[PDB]
């Protein structure tokens, strides 16, 4: 299962 | 007995050719099990291994929602990194990310990973402590400050020590017949005359899983590292891998050469010679 938090660079 | 799970993300801009493409692939060791491609006719997370098919609709929807959000986030990140490097709006650029967890033969978390690259160069990486970052330059330092404010390292540590290991263990159980089965290499030595006084001895290893293997040639018991032509391990297309190691030997001197094979699927390591 992938990591659920998307954080802009 | 050691196992790992990894996700590989590639976000690629293509100015004048639409929005950046986002592809995500998931692996358990050398077995791919999921894919997501923002360029697909109808973008959704798709199964790529039979043991993942048993996962319910909520699993597939959860994956799709994460990757759809990632597609949008990575498009903003590409715009930001273009800015950080004072790059023109003309060039195509790539952000890559690889993360996941490693388990020991006891099933315990050995270590976590989370690394990012820009145009194939290391950019930012989560340190082994799962608490701090290694920023490659002043551009990556901006990402680091953003990631600290969002508390990314703490969120990643919880994931790597928690859900990552939990899901990897679930996949290892559901796919135990393949994932926990090591297929030994089928080995042989071929002889190819190159001239009157020299011949090539090629040591083959076929049908093995996982990809990790050691193929070496020894002359009178000493390693021939500089003289050995070693091809990159290659996929057969049926889950298995192939590799060969070659040495150019003086004609007549073939029995002074031994090929050594080390692989997880083997009851004992192999020593092979050319059998005329």
């Amino acid at each position: 299962l992938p990591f659920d938090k998307s954080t802009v660079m | 007995g050691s196992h790992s799970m990894r996700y590989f993300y590639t976000a690629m801009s293509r100015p004048g050719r639409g929005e950046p493409r986002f592809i995500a692939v998931g692996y358990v060791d050398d077995t791919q099990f999921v894919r997501f491609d923002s360029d697909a006719a109808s973008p959704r997370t798709e199964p790529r291994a039979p043991w993942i098919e048993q996962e319910g609709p909520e699993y597939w929807d959860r994956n799709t929602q994460i990757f759809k959000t990632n597609t949008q986030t990575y498009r903003e990140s590409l715009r930001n990194l273009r800015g950080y490097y004072n790059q023109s709006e003309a060039g195509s650029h790539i952000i890559q990310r690889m993360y996941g967890c490693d388990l020991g033969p006891d099933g315990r978390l050995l270590r976590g990973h989370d690394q990012s690259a820009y145009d194939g160069k290391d950019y930012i990486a989560l340190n082994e402590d799962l608490s701090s970052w290694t920023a490659a330059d002043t551009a990556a330092q901006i990402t680091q400050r953003k990631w600290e404010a969002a508390r990314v390292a703490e969120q990643l540590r919880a994931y790597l020590e928690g859900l990552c290991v939990e899901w990897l263990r679930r996949y290892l159980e559901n796919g135990k017949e393949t994932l926990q089965r090591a297929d030994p290499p089928k080995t042989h030595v071929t002889h190819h005359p190159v001239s009157d006084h020299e011949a090539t001895l090629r040591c083959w290893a076929l049908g093995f899983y996982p990809a990790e293997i050691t193929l070496t040639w020894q002359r009178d018991g000493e390693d021939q590292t500089q003289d050995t032509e070693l091809v990159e391990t290659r996929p057969a297309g049926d889950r298995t891998f192939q590799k060969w190691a070659a040495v150019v030997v003086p004609s007549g001197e073939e029995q002074r050469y031994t090929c050594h094979v080390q692989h997880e699927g083997l009851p004992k390591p192999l020593t092979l010679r050319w059998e005329p």
């Binding site: - | 590989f8 692939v25 790539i94 145009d119 071929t190 090629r202 057969a236 297309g237 060969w244």
Partner: protein
């Protein structure tokens, strides 16, 4: 920009036996950026139904892809892989050798 040329290997899934159905593989790896053109050739002509793996990459960030098709090797038929990448001036053709 730092660009990496593809490594190319042309080979069969199973040991080659004339008249027996097999799979012809063209493995492209160690390249950067990811855009690549790959064709499998039969006597210099492009084979139509060629499938490929999903884009992935190695620990050094370089990309890799497997292109493959069902084929029946013979004594006379010549098989090859034609590859083009930003790093190449013209397409590179690597012939299939069953001893490789």
């Amino acid at each position: 920009m730092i660009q990496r040329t593809p490594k190319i290997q042309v080979y069969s899934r199973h040991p080659a036996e004339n008249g027996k159905s097999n799979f012809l593989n063209c493995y492209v790896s160690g390249f950067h950026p990811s855009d690549i053109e790959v064709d499998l050739l039969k006597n210099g002509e492009r084979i139509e139904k060629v499938e490929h793996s999903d884009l992935s990459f190695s620990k050094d960030w370089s990309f890799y892809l497997l292109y493959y098709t069902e084929f029946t090797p013979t004594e006379k038929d010549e098989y090859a892989c034609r590859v083009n990448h930003v790093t190449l001036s013209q397409p590179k053709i690597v012939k299939w050798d069953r001893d490789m």
